[PDB]
Design a protein around this ligand. Structure first.
Ligand code: BIG
Ligand code: BIG
Lengths: 229, 229
């Protein structure tokens, strides 16, 4: 088997996995809790990072560098941009950008800084494994572009703008950051999100209503990938 | 002696130190280069992270966790908010916030997410050491609050707004993120910035003109702290 990191942002995104696993140990590190469990020949390390790009960047780095994760699967929820996405639908990111990284005053495109690309890619083999698991268990799974930034998006103008600029199918606050860390540290990354809202007016209310259930959909799916890994 | 990390965002913020040290080794890690040099009884690790919160978060984490840094000094430039600051003036951060971490749609204050504080603090002993080095070498040194985010600020309205909300004396794109990592990993952190611009209209032009020189002012100062450490 192998060491696998499973990461969400919030307790709701990781608690369903801890309940399924039953037996696990906990370790305080980096002002957070990291959870350790065996599963089908694999050694799992799980955590919720707390919200946003910095927190998620630190959790990814800790899980790989201190705890030796060889693969990282991200599971959580997201705001839908693509009108064909409904609440509860699963989307995996083929590539991701930071919509709020902005040095456009120097004539560079939005999302770009020197040394880096605008879009960071996820691992192709993990994405194909996800497609087989989706086919095998008759689950609907969509591929797409996720736009990451440190704002909860609940505004039609902002939604439209980010979608237009990056051709994004959903938005969230941890994806591109986690993907960047994994790529830099040479670890295969997979980013999965279940929609909790549509990122327009009253998205905050839809988020509160659907987060728990959508988080379970995503959570279940990444554990099914661990079976096939 | 001890292991010391010295971190900037850009090549201009770290190159002056590499030229002063002359002899050093390099290691390619995390899609970046980390530099190693002996200095007095100390072991130094230096790098420029590339611009922004995610990149700086990763460099801080790598330098502490993989390379064993016991202290981290950040050196670079910043945009001035406090009208008493002129270009080239030195400011160290007593505390820092992320002005662009925004879940205010859920009724929390700007800069806050659950599990974390709005402001992260720097190490008091390093700050007092900086004050003695400032007195000893007749250099003017100011204490203050830095607001961090992933935008280059070059707008008077935005400048005023961020200053009003956080009582910030300067803005930049890496401080709060580096300080958070160090606090979470229990490493003393010190954040020093020399002003390259005033963060209003045509700040981009002042930045290009003064970055190289202001970076040297900050760079020199953190090496003088290494003498006294
Ligand atoms: C006090 C509660 C604050 C919750 S902030 C939103 C959570 C859920 N995550 C994903 C997420 C779903 N929908 C979104 C939207 N519309 N905008 C931005 N992020 C999202 C990001 C972050 O971990
Ligand atoms: C292609 C050139 C891109 C340069 S982007 C600015 C650099 C210098 N750093 C500090 C910095 C000084 N002045 C600032 C301002 N007005 N706004 C925000 N950050 C700052 C942050 C980032 O590493």
């Amino acid at each position: 088997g192998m060491k696998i990191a499973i990461l969400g942002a919030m307790s709701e995104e990781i608690t369903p996995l801890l309940e399924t696993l039953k037996d696990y140990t906990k370790i305080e590190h980096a002002n957070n809790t990291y959870y350790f469990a065996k599963y089908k020949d694999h050694e799992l390390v799980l955590a919720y990072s707390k919200i946003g790009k910095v927190n998620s960047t630190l959790s990814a780095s800790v899980m790989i560098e201190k705890f030796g994760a060889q693969v990282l699967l991200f599971t959580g929820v997201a705001g839908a941009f693509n009108p064909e996405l409904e609440i509860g639908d699963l989307l995996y990111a083929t590539k991701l950008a930071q919509y709020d990284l902005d040095i456009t005053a120097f004539g560079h495109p939005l999302g770009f800084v020197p040394g880096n690309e605008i879009f960071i890619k996820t691992d192709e083999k993990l994405n194909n494994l996800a497609l087989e698991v989706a086919k095998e268990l008759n689950i609907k799974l969509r591929a797409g572009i996720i736009a990451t930034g440190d704002e909860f998006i609940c505004d039609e103008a902002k939604k439209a703008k980010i979608r237009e600029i990056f051709n994004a199918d959903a938005c969230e606050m941890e994806g591109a950051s986690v993907a960047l860390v994994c790529d830099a540290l040479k670890v295969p990354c997979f980013i999965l999100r279940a929609m909790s809202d549509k990122a327009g007016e009253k998205a905050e209310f839809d988020f509160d209503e659907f987060v728990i259930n959508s988080a379970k959909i995503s959570a279940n799916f990444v554990l099914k990938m661990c079976e096939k890994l």
